[PDB]
Amino acid sequence: PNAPACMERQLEAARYRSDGALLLGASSLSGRCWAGSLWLFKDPCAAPNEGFCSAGVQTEAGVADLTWVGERGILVASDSGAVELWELDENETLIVSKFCKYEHDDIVSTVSVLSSGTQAVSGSKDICIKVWDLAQQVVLSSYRAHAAQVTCVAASPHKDSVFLSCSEDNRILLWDTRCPKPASQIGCSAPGYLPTSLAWHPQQSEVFVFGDENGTVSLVDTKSCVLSSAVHSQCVTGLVFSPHSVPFLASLSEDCSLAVLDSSLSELFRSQAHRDFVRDATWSPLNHSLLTTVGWDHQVVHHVVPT
Amino acid sequence: RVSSGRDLNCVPEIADTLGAVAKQGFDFLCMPVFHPRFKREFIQEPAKNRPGPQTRSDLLLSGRDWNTLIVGKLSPWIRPDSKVEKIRRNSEAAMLQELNFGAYLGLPAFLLPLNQEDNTNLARVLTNHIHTGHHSSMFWMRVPLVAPEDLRDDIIENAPTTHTEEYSGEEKTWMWWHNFRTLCDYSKRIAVALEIGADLPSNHVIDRWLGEPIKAAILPTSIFLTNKKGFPVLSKMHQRLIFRLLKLEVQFIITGTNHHSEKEFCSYLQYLEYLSQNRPPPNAYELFAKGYEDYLQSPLQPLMDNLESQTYEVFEKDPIKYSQYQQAIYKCLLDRVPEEEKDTNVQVLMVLGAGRGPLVNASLRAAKQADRRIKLYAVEKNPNAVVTLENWQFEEWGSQVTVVSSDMREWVAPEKADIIVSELLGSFADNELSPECLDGAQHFLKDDGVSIPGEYTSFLAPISSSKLYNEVRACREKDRDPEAQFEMPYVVRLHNFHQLSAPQPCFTFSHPNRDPMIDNNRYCTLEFPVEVNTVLHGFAGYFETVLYQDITLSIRPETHSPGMFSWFPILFPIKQPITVREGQTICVRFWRCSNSKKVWYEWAVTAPVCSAIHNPTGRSYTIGL
Ligand SMILES: Nc1ccc2ccc(CNC(=O)c3ccc4c(c3)c3c(n4CCO)CCCC3)cc2n1
Ligand SMILES: CSC[C@H]1O[C@@H](n2cnc3c(N)ncnc32)[C@H](O)[C@@H]1O
């Protein structure tokens, strides 16, 4: 239905909107043609069957990441070095290209948006970090704080001038766009290994978590003494908090298993449903016990966590 | 013209990409073999059993394209020198897979990055690859001029950049390269590519990159300035660097995205061609020497071996030399015979080492210009030269020229002469045994006579070049001492090298030598300061000569004759490279030794470190009498 006949083999991303609909990202990482696609489903259990998609389009390059902008925009991090914006039409049938700019000199590795709804940031393998104006389709500023591939950025849910970043130089920065020296180094009570992912605590504006290359995660207080626990046999590569009054932390890793942790980092739930690297996970807003995962084994898995 | 290529990290379809690259005028494309984000697990279950093709097939391009138009790249996630054991194991496996695939495809070159000090495992894997099986691919290392940590901005409140001068900070990248190549034993299959940023080093450590196997340069689009018409241009300092690079014929690669999309990406090539087409043209010396850069040849030894006609043909194609000889003769004749005795006085000149007689003709011309009467004796030993002289005598010169076939040291001249003219200098002035020949042929000079040349000297200076070091290493022979290749001089057009210091004089001779017990043996000590942390690979020399009071020839770079080109510098290598620290000096000793049958040189470095004597007794290299 105005969509390509076949979905690419590797699924790399998945996110939900408040109405329960989900967006998948996919790409071909092997074979003759190296490019991806964007797909929309209104029936989560029908995924990844193309025949039941509501919408979808092909892209000119692979998709590194993607997020939601308000209800209709899709912000995409492309392999081409591009930053691009797509928009859902009135009938949620076609996905329309709004713009495409080429501001990075290498693959865009991460993208996120800020709480103001008009700002966004991106990172790339090129060490440069950029700040975007989503309304004007321009770059507002750029910084070169890191001397290594950027691996993760995240926006604070509470402040529209604030974000976190890290790269393979073992440095973690906190940013404030209102300062003459926008970055501040967090430092670390347990240095020596490279961090792999970052996430903000949903309720506490001064609390965040991160994971590293050894499969260990840590909970830290921005103002200062840390809490940590080993979980995975391999690099963490991904963290997300559940939509609860008492949040739970989902943790992915390269060991292909999935885990859900308590606030104490105690393990509550574990799964080995996947047969390949797991790439992402998201919570369904309409069902607080339900966690949905995506990965390179082309499976869509619905887990119920005994919360 | 200037060869170039494009660097891409995103190639959705190779057929179209390659087409577009060619459309814009590029000669080649650098690109990954495997999608760069497609990490492949080894060892660990179940990931290692992931099904499916791992990359695109090779049936998409013809064999001709694979081995001509494509340069490979290592995937960015591979890190053999990481600290976590698990990563290291996957990284080594991944590296071998990619190298073997590139070998399968026949790619002419592949790129590997260097971005830190410890690259020990990277080197280990690569050398095992190099020595296994049979492959011809070239490996280029990508090294920035300035380490990225020093290019960061200062926007971190509690993490300021260094704002002082840490001298060694300007040398980090060179060191990384240096250590890598020694780990890999200077393999000839390993070379470099340099990445140029906006911030350039001082003139030093620019110069230190010369004498290095640079094959390519990488220029991001990010370092172009925009001119008044909106086109990318270079700063003056960047232009100076490009002009220097053009002399080594390195290839240029353009990377990054299009920051001037409104002007068409190909405009970057147009600018580069503009600069190369406005470089100044080469002079005759350079044109003459084209094709011999850093090419080694054994020196000639005419006293012992008879030269063939073609050698002579070449020696004669350099008119500046003969003009200088003619002037020397002209003045000498005028200075000996006054006008009043002109028609009653005949001078006798002898040419020793007449060859095909270009000096005979020069001598006759000088005499004509000077309006002075002369008689000539041409003496040569080479019978294959004597034969041409016979014809010259008969057909044109007439009775005024006598031709003698003999060894000048044995021949008894019937008459004494007052002017002796010779062309016995070699590339290092005395390595042709010219003083022995002339001392012998001294007894027939009139006591008030003159030698042309009357004086000659020689110079030495320390040099560095890793390329030359390998060219020498390569010149091995069977049933010969394996090191006897570092104990003999070479004739070479030195090009890709760095000079460490000013030349200094070493050995000097003059004629006629009236001293009793002259002794042609020599000993000399030289010492040179060093202002760069570099590596010494050998010494090179030059010479100067005085044909007459105010007439000289020279090949010292500083006083080099204006268009003289038949001569090349002499190279004297040492067995082991020596690292020299700034502020130290290099002390070198030379000897000129002889016996009744042979002449040979011996040499050694005594400081900053000591080295072995090279060529003791003439065991590896001799000059025959
Ligand atoms: N008494 C004189 C007079 C003139 C001179 C001019 C220059 C020099 C220095 N050059 C050398 O020793 C030298 C070595 C290898 C060479 C040649 C030259 C040439 C050839 N090869 C390769 C092997 O055959 C190939 C054919 C053309 C020339 C010495 C002189 N000594
Ligand atoms: C101008 S090329 C050098 C010339 O020196 C000549 N030559 C070298 N040694 C002698 C010698 N001992 N007697 C005569 N000619 C010599 C060689 O034959 C050659 O022609």
Author numbering:
A (entry chain B): 21 to 244, 247 to 329
B (entry chain A): 13 to 637
Provide the publication's sentences verbatim.
Surface plasma resonance (SPR) studies detected that 11-2F binds to PRMT5:MEP50 with an apparent KD ~13.6 μM without MTA, but its affinity increased drastically to ~82 nM in the presence of 25 μM MTA, much better than its synergy with SAM and S-adenosyl-l-homocysteine (SAH). Cryo-EM structures of 11-2 F / MTA-bound human PRMT5/MEP50 complex and its apo form resolved at 3.1 and 3.2 Å respectively show that 11-2 F in the catalytic pocket shifts the cofactor-binding pocket away by ~2.0 Å, contributing to positive cooperativity. The PRMT5:MEP50/MTA/11-2F complex was prepared by mixing stock solutions of MTA and 11-2F with 0.4 mg/ml PRMT5:MEP50 (~0.09 µM) on ice for 30 min before being applied to glow-discharged QuantiFoil grids. The density for MTA, is well resolved, and right next to 11-2 F. The top pose from AUTODOCK is very close to the final refined model (yellow vs. green) with only one rotation of the quinoline group by 180 degrees after refinement, suggesting that a cryo-EM map of 3.1 Å contains sufficient details of the ligand for selecting and refining the top poses generated by computational analysis, leading to an accurate model of the ligand, even though individual atoms in two multi-member rings of the quinoline are not resolved in the cryo-EM map. The aromatic ring of quinoline is stacked in parallel to sidechains of Phe 327 and Trp579.
MEP50, a 7-WD40 β-propeller protein, binds PRMT5 via contacts with the TIM barrel, making a hetero-octameric PRMT5:MEP50 complex one of an apparent D2 symmetry. The octamer methylates a broad spectrum of substrates, including COPR5, SWI/SNF47, pICln48, Riok149, Menin50, etc., and making targeted PRMT5 inhibition a potential cancer therapy.
